[PDB]
C-alpha cells in the first residue's frame, strides 16, 4: 500500500503540470484573436478541472 501514496503524489504532479501547461493567454489580435485565445483557454480549464476531479476521486472513492 506504499505505492498508492506515491501514485497519488505522481497523480497530483500531473494535474499541477496540466494547469501549468495551460497558461493565461498573451493579448494579441485586437479583441478578435484576444477573445478567441480567451474562449480557447476557458474551454481547456474546464477540461483540466473535470479530468482532475475524475482522477482524484479514484484516490478518495
Amino acid at each position, epitope marked *: 500500500s506504499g505505492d498508492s501514496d506515491e501514485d497519488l503524489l*505522481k497523480a497530483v504532479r500531473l494535474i499541477k503540470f496540466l494547469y501549468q501547461s495551460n497558461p493565461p493567454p498573451n493579448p494579441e489580435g485586437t479583441r478578435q484573436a484576444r477573445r478567441n485565445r480567451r474562449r480557447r483557454w476557458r474551454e481547456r480549464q474546464r477540461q483540466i478541472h473535470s479530468i482532475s476531479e475524475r482522477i482524484l476521486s479514484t484516490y478518495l472513492g
Partner: single-chain antibody
Amino acid sequence: ELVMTQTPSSVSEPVGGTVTIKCQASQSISSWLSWYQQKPGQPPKLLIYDASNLASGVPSRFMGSGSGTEYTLTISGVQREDAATYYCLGGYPAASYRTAFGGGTELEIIQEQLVESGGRLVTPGTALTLTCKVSGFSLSGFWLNWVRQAPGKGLEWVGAIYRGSGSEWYASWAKGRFTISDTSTTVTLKLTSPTTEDTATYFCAADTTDNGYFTIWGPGTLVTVSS
C-alpha cells in the same frame, strides 16, 4: 487493479443478426470505456468512446451502452466486413486502478502518425529498446501508451507517459520490468531484463483528447525473445 471482465469469448453469427458484446468493470470507471475493432495483422481501430459515442467514419450499426458498471457493444445489422476481434478499454493511466483491456471477443460471420521500430530477436536477458516516432500531432502534450500483444493472445496495456512531463504510469506486472521515456519527436519503451513471456507485437497508441481513449495507433513492432 482494474479488471475488465469480457463475455463471450467468441460468437458465430449470420449476416444481419444482432451481436451483443459485454464488459464488466471491477471498479466504477463511469464514462471511461472505449471499444476497439481489430483485424488480423492490423492495429486496433477505435469504434466507440466515452461509453456511448461513435468515432468519426464508423457506421451506425455499432452502438455503445453503459449502466454504471456493466457495458455493451451491439453490432445490429452485421456484415462480412465486421468479422474481426473486439475489445473494451476501461479506466485511465493516471487513475488508482489504472487502465485495463477486456479479454476480447472474436466475431465470425456466415495528419497524426505513430511508428514503432526496434522489434527484433533479443536473447533472454538482453535489454531491448522499442522506439515510437511521433509526427503531425497538433498537440504538444498528450498520453502516449504502449500496448503489447503475444501471438494469438489479447491486447495488454504496458503503460503510458504524459508527453509533456515525466508522468510514467504502468500496469502491476509491468512495473520494474518496463521503462517509458520521452524525447523530441519520439517516445521509447525499454525492456530491462526480458523473458520469453515478453514475445509479442508492441504498439504505441495516442490519446489525443486526454479523456482516456486511443484514437491513433502505430503499425506495431514484432519482438521475439528466443535463444
